[PDB]
Ligand binder design. Structure first.
Ligand SMILES: Nc1nc2c(ncn2[C@@H]2O[C@H](COP(=O)(O)OP(=O)(O)O)[C@@H](O)[C@H]2O)c(=O)[nH]1
Lengths: 95, 67, 151, 280
């Protein structure tokens, strides 16, 4: 039965070394914070271009006004209306 | 009307609806299309008619079926 | 001085999503909305749409965003960048920078003539233009915090 | 891992217990004191299970009184303790050494060691190693002695040493101790030497934490104490009664950035410590 305990101790040694390696792999230094490179400038068009690059000529040919003029203004107004945020009071209090 | 795409002079999407929700990559092309004094334009591509309106430096593109 | 409750309410209100009615276009809420410092990048105030681990991760993300923003604020070359949206409200000039953090859209804007920053983080499906409009209209209502410096 | 305290009457066992454990395997359990007077030991008086249930036997010798008879009694105890169980670690504390010189202390420890070795040679015991610690209540010595005794009864010592060394190497930590909330018996540290002054700083930090928390109760212990030179002292409660106190140096960096990276690293370390059942 002690040989089974020896095998259990070997498995425990492997498990503890795996635990040490796992908790060693998540250590982040300040050099990793300063030079991470994760925070990169991204635009919608560049994100779409990267999506098409990972997934994978002048298509457009040059040839109502009231409806489009109404809908564009209404969409802009509905965008600007929900962005209006009213504070619940003063932000800075005096003495 | 099949969908709408709202983007400023930088071309960043403000809204993407309909087929235009999956047709973003043409925006970089559509920045090279001239407009008129009123801002209205009708450009045909991929068997679709795109109506462009530029107001306050924001171009809105509306997709309509050619047929 | 400062008031944490009113700033907390403001940051919670800036987590409100958009529900357009003329065009059926529902948008999710922002992942986080916070106000940080322009010197060390730590969290002054914060708010989440939906505990200690997420707070530490948000502090790390704020530090990373300020670390990326510090070099951008001190660089004058390639100033005509497509991701920069410098707006001037009430004769106060500022620069707004957008960034992609893997699957997250992070928009930061320095509060003009002050040592503070406002940061909005949303999911990858969130449009950048709506974020720019959101942060512009948020900075429009923050006139009381203008000219505030750390002691 | 229950440790048994043994010694002559009026040697100080109760006082040591009161000072340390009053102010399972790893927690400061209710230890067993055993007043052993000079007598003839009864052969196998149902004491085999008792000494088989003791992880490590601790003997207390008063340095003020004569101790040759005490060493003889200790050898008599070891004579059956090692026979019953060949895996018991044997510990001897030379207690009440506050009013002695350094040369006298070293000579007394050498004399005690030589006498114990000669008596064990006479009794024929071989392969036994008895450790000796100069302890006193009025200083840090008893805490360090119990720290070594407890460390001898944790089988995961080297893995905790590696975990703390990796945590220190990646957080600019000067010195990190894994204390227990009671008895101030530090369980693990790094490969750096245990400085006495830093140990006392961390222990009195534990005391300040617990007292200030107990002053305001009835509504996870965390502490950041920053000094004038930027050196910070950090406390975070680990699983069960364990807690982590780290002296971290800024090295001319941002205080809040260092605090954030230390918090993230220590939370990762606690998540790793959750997997191993080192608690309790
Ligand atoms: N000066 C000094 N006196 C000690 C120390 N430890 C114990 N004593 C003395 O020992 C007495 C207590 O012994 P006690 O614990 O009751 O003995 P026990 O009941 O046999 O364990 C006290 O009166 C102390 O004066 C020590 O470290 N320094």
């Amino acid at each position: 039965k002690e040989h089974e305990h020896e095998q259990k101790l070997l498995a425990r040694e492997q498990e503890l070394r795996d635990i040490v390696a796992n908790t060693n792999d998540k250590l982040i230094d300040i050099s990793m914070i300063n030079n991470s490179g994760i925070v990169i400038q991204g635009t919608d068009l560049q994100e779409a271009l990267d999506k098409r690059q990972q997934e994978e000529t002048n298509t457009f040919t040059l040839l109502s006004k009231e409806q489009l003029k109404k809908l564009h203004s209404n969409i802009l107004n509905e965008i600007f209306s929900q962005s209006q945020v009213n504070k619940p009071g003063p932000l800075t209090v005096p003495f | 009307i099949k969908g709408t795409i709202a983007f400023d002079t930088h071309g960043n999407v403000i809204e993407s609806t309909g087929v235009g929700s999956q047709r973003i990559e043409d925006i970089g092309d559509l920045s090279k299309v001239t407009l008129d004094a009123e801002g209205f334009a009708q450009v045909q591509g991929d068997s679709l008619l795109v109506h462009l309106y530029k107001r306050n430096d924001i171009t809105l593109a509306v997709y309509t079926s050619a047929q | 001085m400062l008031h944490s409750k009113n700033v907390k309410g403001f940051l919670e209100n800036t987590l409100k999503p958009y529900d357009l009615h003329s065009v059926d276009f529902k948008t999710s809420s922002l992942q986080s909305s916070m106000i940080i410092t322009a010197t060390n990048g730590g969290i002054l105030s914060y708010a989440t749409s939906n505990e200690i681990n997420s707070v530490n991760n948000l502090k790390m993300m704020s530090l990373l965003i300020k670390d990326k923003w510090s070099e951008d604020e001190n660089d004058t070359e390639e100033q005509h960048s497509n991701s920069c949206y410098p707006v001037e409200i009430d004769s106060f000039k500022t620069k707004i920078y957008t960034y992609e953090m893997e699957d997250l859209h992070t928009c930061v804007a320095q509060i003009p003539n002050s040592d503070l920053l406002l940061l909005f983080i949303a999911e990858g499906s969130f449009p950048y233009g709506l974020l720019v409009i959101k942060i512009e209209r948020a900075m429009r209502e923050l006139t009381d915090l203008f000219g505030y410096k750390l002691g | 891992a229950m440790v048994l305290l043994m010694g002559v009457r009026r040697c100080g066992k109760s006082s040591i217990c009161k000072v340390v454990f009053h102010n399972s395997t790893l927690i400061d359990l209710a230890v067993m004191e055993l007043p052993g007077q000079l007598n003839y030991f009864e052969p196998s008086y149902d004491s085999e299970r008792l000494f088989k249930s003791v992880g490590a036997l601790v003997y207390v010798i008063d340095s003020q009184d004569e101790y040759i008879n005490a060493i003889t009694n200790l050898a008599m105890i070891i004579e059956y303790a090692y026979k019953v169980n060949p895996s018991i670690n044997i510990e001897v504390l030379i207690h009440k050494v506050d009013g002695l010189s350094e040369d006298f202390k070293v000579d007394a420890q050498r004399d005690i060691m030589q006498r114990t070795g000669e008596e064990l040679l006479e009794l024929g015991l071989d392969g036994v190693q008895v450790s000796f610690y100069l302890t006193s209540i009025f200083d840090h010595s008893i805490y360090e002695a119990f720290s070594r005794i407890v460390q001898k009864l944790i089988p995961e010592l080297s893995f905790l040493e590696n975990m703390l060394d990796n945590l220190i190497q990646h957080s600019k930590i000067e010195k990190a101790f894994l204390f227990d909330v009671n008895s101030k018996i530090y369980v693990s540290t790094d490969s750096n030497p245990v400085d006495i002054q830093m140990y006392e700083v961390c222990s009195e930090f534990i005391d300040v934490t617990i007292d200030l928390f107990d002053l305001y109760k009835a509504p996870e212990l965390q502490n950041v104490s920053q000094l004038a030179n930027g050196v910070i002292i950090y406390l975070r409660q680990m699983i069960r009664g364990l807690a982590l106190v780290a002296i971290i140096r800024p090295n001319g960096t941002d205080m809040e950035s260092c605090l954030t990276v230390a918090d993230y690293n220590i939370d990762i370390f606690k998540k790793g410590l959750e997997d191993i059942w080192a608690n309790a």
